[PDB]
Structures are given as C-alpha cells and as structure tokens.
Design a protein around this ligand. Structure first.
Ligand SMILES: CCCCCCC/C=C/CCCCCC(=O)OC[C@@H](O)CO
Ligand SMILES: CCCCCCC/C=C\CCCCCC(=O)OC[C@@H](O)CO
Ligand SMILES: CCCCCCC/C=C\CCCCCC(=O)OC[C@@H](O)CO
Ligand SMILES: CCCCCCC/C=C\CCCCCC(=O)OC[C@@H](O)CO
Ligand SMILES: CCCCCCC/C=C\CCCCCC(=O)OC[C@H](O)CO
Ligand SMILES: CCCCCCC/C=C\CCCCCC(=O)OC[C@H](O)CO
Ligand SMILES: CCCCCCC/C=C\CCCCCC(=O)OC[C@H](O)CO
Ligand SMILES: CCCCCCC/C=C\CCCCCC(=O)OC[C@H](O)CO
Ligand SMILES: CCCCCCC/C=C\CCCCCC(=O)OC[C@H](O)CO
Ligand SMILES: CCCCCCC/C=C\CCCCCC(=O)OC[C@H](O)CO
Ligand SMILES: CCCCCCC/C=C\CCCCCC(=O)OC[C@H](O)CO
Ligand SMILES: CCCCCCC/C=C\CCCCCC(=O)OC[C@H](O)CO
Ligand SMILES: CCCCCCC/C=C\CCCCCC(=O)OC[C@H](O)CO
Ligand SMILES: CCCCCCC/C=C\CCCCCC(=O)OC[C@H](O)CO
Ligand SMILES: CCCCCCC/C=C\CCCCCC(=O)OC[C@H](O)CO
Ligand SMILES: CCCCCCC/C=C\CCCCCC(=O)OC[C@H](O)CO
Ligand SMILES: CCCCCCC/C=C\CCCCCC(=O)OC[C@H](O)CO
Ligand SMILES: CCCCCCC/C=C\CCCCCC(=O)OC[C@H](O)CO
Ligand code: NA
Length: 455
C-alpha cells in the first residue's frame, strides 16, 4: 500500500503543506483589498501604492525568512518541532487579523507569519526527504506529489476564502485562513507521530559547545547594527513607512550583492534572470490583483478568485513538462537557454497586458481573459526556469545554493519599489516597459548562453 507509489508518510506532509499553503494564499488573495478597505474608511493612513509595496516586501521577507529556518531546525530546535511551532505562529498570524482590530493588527500578523513560515516551509520539505533512503529512486516522484499538494492548497484557498470574504466580511475570511492552518496542524501532529522518524524531533547537527558564543555574537551584532540604522533614520527624519520599506529592500538586495562580492561570474546573468522572473511572477498578487479589481468586469464573482489561475496553470502544465523533458531526447535546450526563454515568456505576459489599455483606453473594463492569458504565459515561463534553477545553480556552495532561493526574495524586494509606479495613468507604459525589458534581457541571455553552458 502506498500514497501514489510513495511511503504512506508522504500523505501527512502532503496535507500539512496543502493546508499551510491554503492559509497563506487565502490571506494573500484578500490582504491587498483589505488594506484598500482600511484606507477607504480612514483607518489606515497610507496610499494604495504603499499598500501594494507592503504586499511585495511582505513576500520578500517571507522568502528571506525561509532561507534561515532550515538552519534553526538543523542546529537548534529540530525539523519536527520547527514545522509544529512554525504552524502555530502562522495560525496566530491569521487569528490576529480575525480579531476585531483594524490597521493596528497588521504588523503583528505580518511578523507572526514571516517567522512562522520561515520555520515551517523549508522544514516540511526536509521531512519529505527523510521518508526516503539515500538511493531510493522514488525521491523525485515523491517530491513531485508533495508539490502537487502545495499547488492544490494555493488553488482552492482564493476560491473558498475569497467567497467567504464577500459573504461574511474580512475577519471571518481571515479566521478561515486560521482554521486551515489548524487543520494542517491536526493532521501533521497526529499523522506525524505515526510515520516520522523520532530522530527529527531533535536537531540533527546540534551546535557544538564552542559554536554557541560566535553564533550569539553574530546575531547580536546584526540586530545591533540594524537597530542603529533605524535610530539614525529617525534622527535624520527618514521614518515614514516607505522609508522602512526601502531599508528592507536594501537589506534583501544587499545580501546577495555581498555574497557575490565575497565570491561564479557566469552565474550573475542567470541570477539576474531569476530575480527579474520572480519579480514579474510575484506581481500577480499585487499589480494583476489591482488590475483584476479595477479594470476587469468581474461583477458576478469575487475578484480574489483570479489568484487561483497561477496555481491552476502550474498544475495543468506540470505533468506535460515532466513528460516533455524525457521525450525531448535529442538537443534538449540547456539550462541557461531555459532561463532566457523563461524570462522571455514572463516578458510576454506583461506585453500582453499592455494591449487592452492601448486598444480600449484605461478608463473602461476589459475581459477576464486578458489576465487568464497573462498567467498562462508567465507560468509557461515558470515551467522553464523553476525546475532547473537549483540544479544549474548547484552545478555551477551552501551559500550560493541559498542565493537561488534568495532570488525570489530579491525579486519581491525589487517589486516593493516597482509596484508603486503602477496606476491607471501609467498602466500601458508600465506593462510595456517591464515587459519589453524582460524580453530584451532574455535575448541578451540567449547570446550569452553558449559561453555559460561551457563554463
Ligand atoms: C501551448 C503553450 C501555449 C499556451 C499559453 C498561450 C496562451 C496565450 C494567450 C494570449 C491571448 C489571450 C488574450 C486574448 C483576450 O484577451 O481575449 C479578449 C476577448 O476574448 C474578449 O474581448
Ligand atoms: C478556545 C481555546 C481552547 C482550545 C484549547 C487549546 C488548543 C488550541 C490550539 C492548539 C494549536 C495546535 C493544535 C495542534 C494539535 O494537534 O495539538 C496537539 C496536542 O495535543 C499536543 O499534545
Ligand atoms: C550583481 C547581482 C545583483 C542582483 C540585483 C538584482 C536586480 C538586477 C538588476 C536591476 C533590474 C532592473 C531594475 C529596475 C529598473 O530598471 O528601474 C527602472 C526605473 O524605471 C524604475 O524607477
Ligand atoms: C521559443 C520562443 C523563442 C522566440 C522568442 C522571440 C521574441 C518574440 C517577440 C518579441 C516581441 C517584442 C516586442 C515588444 C514591443 O512591441 O514593445 C512596444 C512598446 O515598447 C512600445 O512602447
Ligand atoms: C498557543 C496555542 C498553541 C498551543 C499548541 C499546543 C501545545 C501542546 C503540546 C506541544 C506539542 C509539541 C509538538 C512538537 C513537535 O515536534 O510535534 C511534531 C510531532 O511530533 C510530529 O512530528
Ligand atoms: C529574516 C526576516 C525577518 C525580517 C522581518 C521584518 C519584516 C517586517 C515587516 C515587513 C514589512 C511590512 C511593513 C508594512 C506594515 O508592517 O504594515 C503596518 C501598518 O501599515 C501600519 O501602518
Ligand atoms: C522568537 C520567536 C517568537 C515570535 C514572537 C513574534 C511576536 C510578534 C508580534 C507580537 C504582537 C502581535 C499581536 C499584536 C496585536 O495583536 O495588535 C493589537 C494591538 O492593537 C497592537 O497595536
Ligand atoms: C485554537 C483555535 C484555532 C482555530 C482558529 C480560530 C478561529 C475561531 C473562530 C473564528 C471567529 C472569527 C470571528 C469573526 C468576526 O469577528 O465577525 C465579526 C464581523 O466583523 C461581523 O461581520
Ligand atoms: C531576533 C532574535 C533572534 C534569536 C536568536 C537566535 C539564536 C541566537 C544565538 C544562538 C543560541 C542558540 C541556543 C544554543 C543551544 O541551545 O544549543 C546548545 C548546544 O547544542 C549545547 O552544546
Ligand atoms: C535580538 C538580540 C540578540 C538576540 C540574542 C539571543 C540570546 C538568546 C539566547 C542566548 C542563550 C545563551 C546561550 C546559552 C545556551 O542557551 O546554551 C545552554 C545549553 O543548552 C547548555 O548546554
Ligand atoms: C537583520 C535582522 C534585524 C531584525 C529585522 C526585524 C525588523 C522589524 C521591523 C522593521 C521595520 C518595519 C516597521 C514598519 C512600521 O510599522 O513602521 C510604521 C511606523 O511605526 C509609522 O510610520
Ligand atoms: C554604514 C551603513 C549605514 C546605512 C545603512 C543602509 C541603509 C541606509 C538608508 C536606508 C534607506 C532610507 C530611505 C529613506 C527614504 O526613502 O526617504 C525618507 C522617506 O521617503 C520619507 O520619510
Ligand atoms: C478544476 C478546473 C477549474 C478551472 C477554473 C478555476 C476558476 C479560477 C479562477 C476564475 C477566474 C475568473 C475567470 C473568468 C472567465 O474566464 O470568464 C470568461 C468570460 O469571458 C467572462 O466574461
Ligand atoms: C496536449 C498539450 C498541448 C495542447 C495545447 C493546449 C492549448 C489550449 C488552448 C490555448 C488557447 C490559445 C488562445 C488562442 C488565442 O490567443 O487567440 C486570440 C484571439 O485573437 C482572440 O480573439
Ligand atoms: C507556445 C507559446 C506561445 C503561445 C502564443 C499564442 C497566442 C498568440 C497570439 C495572442 C495575441 C494576443 C492579442 C489577442 C487580441 O488582441 O485579440 C483581440 C481581442 O478580440 C480583443 O478583445
Ligand atoms: C506569443 C504571445 C504574444 C502575446 C504578447 C505580444 C504583445 C506584443 C506587443 C504588445 C505591446 C503593446 C504596447 C502598446 C503601446 O505601448 O501603445 C501605447 C499606446 O499609445 C497607449 O498608451
Ligand atoms: C495538458 C496540457 C496543458 C494545456 C493547457 C492549455 C492552456 C493554454 C492556454 C490558455 C489560454 C486561455 C486564453 C483563452 C483565449 O484567449 O480565447 C479567446 C476567446 O475564445 C475569444 O472569445
Ligand atoms: C550592483 C547591483 C545592485 C543594484 C540593485 C538592483 C535593483 C536596482 C534598483 C531598484 C529599483 C529602484 C527604483 C525605485 C523606484 O522606481 O521608485 C521607488 C518608489 O517610487 C518609492 O519607494
Ligand atoms: Na466581483
């Protein structure tokens, strides 16, 4: 007996992640509109631009947090408690928004979810690995199934949580996100005790006695430096929310920049390609979400439901490309070539979105099929770059590996700056330029492709 050919324990981790992703993308699909609401009532004193900026830097920090949680599990608390307590923090984050507060609860929610996801996300993925002996051929299949559970959660949550929001309001919808994580904890806790190795209740590489102090010194100096920067910021009068967002942008970009400088050259165009690609892919929940609400005739259905298109297309495309990369025996494109083309599709997905405004004006409303087409194109690009991203990075070590996972944090950090440029007046130029820019850089990478596959 198996779960799709895999060890039964995969079913537990599959459902754990399904419900965690349910809670996350449920929250994400209505959080921008929530902020709009809070602005409209005078409760939240920011612009819509800044609110878009918040969505982006929020994602950036969630990704950054994720590149840290593995270390914390492996060296300090253990992967199994990391997933558990991570999930508890996430749940608390959604409960905070379900409570009868307004703008004042936003920051606490965000911090809880940033920390919680940093604990849970890398570490569930680690427990999936543990189901398999070192040389088990099923490993890639198992991970492919696990990812399907991720995508399934991402897909149903906007539908269910978005509907809930429109029927019963924001607080009830947010409480549904909390309940989703709770279900995931239930299944995780009781299902985990049945199938997971007891070894992973503890760190597998605990800090040695002489490793504790230098770690403490490092963290302490980092916190002190960060705090000192904020202090100087407030002294020189740079203390608005955009300023704080800018500080976080700089931190998220500085981190790979320093890693590069420390250290490879061949990787820079690949990494820049990844960054730009994730930028465009992460704007679906921000700029495309805005377009959905403002420019699409969606009067008969919740506009949050558009956020389901991204994981729908991932799910549709995935078995096809799985087959494709095996069927394509002779002259399959190299990984650098995949990045190039992947970025070109991202670019096409924005170029497409420039058409309706150019043709019809930006004052009216256009068909939902423009967005459907846009997501169709960007996910095509995702199928090209995502499955080879870690591989091409690895084959070109622990720090640079993380830079691949960092690419999406950097992409979102960049978004925190760019999405503030988006509005009805700039819509066509915005989609045109960043669309065109991505295509062109994709063409640059094609030129560089031969040199790179060589190295
Ligand atoms: C096999 C790989 C290709 C699959 C992805 C390609 C899909 C690209 C679609 C772009 C065109 C869709 C936009 C057309 C559109 O907006 O229609 C509006 C019109 O139908 C209603 O007024
Ligand atoms: C309305 C508050 C009363 C609820 C009692 C407190 C429990 C509430 C939330 C716990 C969150 C994690 C639940 C996951 C779980 O299965 O807990 C396992 C627990 O039995 C470990 O011994
Ligand atoms: C050495 C590797 C560092 C990686 C940094 C990641 C980003 C790399 C290049 C920046 C991409 C384009 C930046 C956005 C841009 O062009 O701004 C256009 C301007 O209109 C915005 O005000
Ligand atoms: C397997 C696919 C490989 C072929 C990909 C070739 C790239 C295809 C089309 C590039 C279209 C670029 C046109 C952009 C454009 O018209 O911009 C106009 C806009 O900037 C006006 O301000
Ligand atoms: C503040 C509300 C949340 C309170 C949560 C209930 C706390 C009760 C018991 C703590 C459970 C600790 C479990 C740690 C853990 O690793 O669980 C993993 C499971 O053994 C499966 O791997
Ligand atoms: C290693 C990751 C740890 C970094 C955590 C820092 C991230 C903290 C906040 C993310 C940026 C959110 C700023 C917007 C925000 O908090 O909204 C607050 C309300 O708008 C108050 O007006
Ligand atoms: C070292 C891991 C421990 C993680 C602890 C994270 C703590 C983050 C936030 C704590 C406060 C969150 C709730 C704040 C809140 O409920 O807002 C209501 C008040 O009106 C706030 O102004
Ligand atoms: C251990 C609890 C984990 C389960 C998640 C907790 C969610 C429990 C109950 C949800 C209650 C949410 C109240 C919604 C609410 O406040 O409605 C007020 C609205 O403003 C009125 O339309
Ligand atoms: C925002 C504050 C971040 C929280 C600090 C993170 C941890 C900071 C320093 C590392 C201390 C970790 C505890 C060390 C520990 O318990 O391990 C014991 C050793 O295994 C015994 O040899
Ligand atoms: C945000 C400010 C910087 C944060 C500093 C985090 C400090 C938190 C805990 C430090 C604990 C000091 C290490 C001693 C320790 O915990 O090891 C005990 C071992 O378990 C005994 O073998
Ligand atoms: C390098 C690790 C240092 C720890 C990073 C955690 C940083 C926590 C918050 C960063 C600043 C975000 C503040 C957002 C905010 O609410 O500002 C609003 C102001 O209070 C009013 O304008
Ligand atoms: C030796 C390092 C010292 C500097 C650390 C790097 C971070 C420096 C500045 C953070 C960026 C602050 C941007 C402020 C800003 O955007 O203008 C102010 C607001 O727009 C309006 O209040
Ligand atoms: C299991 C397959 C289910 C696939 C459908 C999932 C629905 C997800 C998002 C719905 C987004 C709304 C699309 C609107 C639409 O396509 O309508 C086309 C008509 O031309 C509208 O005028
Ligand atoms: C078995 C895998 C291969 C199957 C290919 C699946 C492609 C299915 C639908 C793609 C639809 C393409 C949209 C056509 C299109 O964009 O035309 C635009 C028209 O000008 C709109 O008036
Ligand atoms: C294999 C990946 C490539 C798939 C590309 C197929 C799509 C080809 C052309 C789509 C061009 C988009 C413009 C469609 C358009 O404007 O139609 C006009 C509509 O009637 C406007 O209401
Ligand atoms: C293979 C599928 C291709 C789908 C995307 C191809 C679209 C190609 C070019 C679209 C760029 C449209 C730009 C329109 C534009 O910028 O004109 C500005 C007008 O003056 C309106 O402000
Ligand atoms: C198993 C292989 C995966 C095949 C999935 C096919 C999805 C590919 C492209 C979907 C593009 C949807 C846009 C629909 C569209 O533009 O049609 C135009 C309207 O019919 C005009 O009235
Ligand atoms: C040596 C590589 C490091 C270069 C960093 C890569 C990203 C470069 C710039 C980020 C884009 C900054 C544009 C800011 C912008 O357009 O407006 C910002 C908003 O209007 C206010 O926050
Ligand atoms: Na609607």
């Amino acid at each position: 007996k198996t779960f799709f050919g895999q060890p039964l324990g995969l079913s537990t981790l599959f459902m754990t992640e399904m419900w965690e992703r349910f809670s996350y993308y449920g929250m994400r699909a209505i959080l921008l509109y929530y902020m709009w609401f809070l602005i409209s009532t005078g409760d939240l004193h920011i612009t819509r631009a800044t609110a878009a900026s918040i969505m982006a830097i929020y994602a950036s920090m969630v990704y950054l947090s994720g590149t840290i949680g593995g270390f914390v599990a492996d060296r300090i608390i253990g992967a199994r408690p990391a997933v558990f307590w991570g999930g508890v923090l996430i749940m608390l984050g959604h409960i905070v928004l379900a409570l009868p507060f307004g703008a004042s609860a936003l920051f606490g929610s965000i911090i809880l979810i940033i920390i919680g996801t940093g604990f849970l996300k890398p570490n569930v993925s680690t427990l999936v690995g543990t189901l398999y002996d070192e040389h088990d051929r099923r490993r890639d299949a198992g991970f492919s199934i696990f990812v399907f559970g991720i995508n399934l959660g991402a897909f149903i949550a906007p539908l269910i949580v978005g509907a809930a929001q429109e029927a019963a309001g924001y607080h009830v919808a947010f409480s549904l996100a909390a309940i989703g994580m709770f279900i995931g904890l239930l299944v995780y806790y009781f299902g985990g005790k049945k199938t997971l190795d007891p070894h992973y209740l503890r760190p597998t590489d605990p800090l040695a006695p002489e490793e504790v102090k230098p770690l403490l010194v490092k963290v302490s100096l980092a916190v002190a430096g960060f705090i000192a920067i904020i202090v100087v910021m407030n002294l020189v009068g740079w203390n608005s929310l955009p300023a704080y967002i800018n500080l976080l942008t700089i931190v998220a970009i500085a981190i790979p920049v320093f890693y590069f400088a420390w250290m490879v050259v061949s990787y820079i165009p690949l990494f820049i390609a990844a960054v730009l690609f994730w930028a465009i892919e992460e704007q679906g929940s921000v700029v495309l979400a805005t377009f959905a609400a403002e420019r699409v005739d969606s009067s008969w259905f919740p506009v949050s439901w558009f956020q389901s298109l991204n994981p729908l297309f991932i799910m549709l495309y995935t078995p096809f490309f799985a087959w494709l990369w095996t069927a394509w025996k002779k002259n399959q494109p190299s990984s650098p070539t995949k990045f190039a083309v992947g970025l070109m599709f991202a670019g096409l997905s924005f170029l497409l979105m420039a058409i309706p405004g150019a043709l019809y004006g930006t004052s009216g409303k256009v068909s939902p099929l423009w967005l459907v087409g846009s997501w169709a194109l960007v996910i095509l690009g995702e199928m090209l770059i995502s499955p080879v991203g870690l591989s091409v990075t690895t084959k070109l070590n622990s720090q640079m590996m993380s830079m691949w996972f960092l690419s999406s944090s950097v992409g979102s950090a960049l978004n925190a700056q760019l999405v503030t440029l988006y509005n009805a007046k700039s819509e066509v130029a915005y989609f045109s330029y960043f669309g065109l820019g991505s295509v062109v850089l994709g063409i640059v990478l094609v030129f560089l492709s031969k040199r790179i596959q060589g190295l």
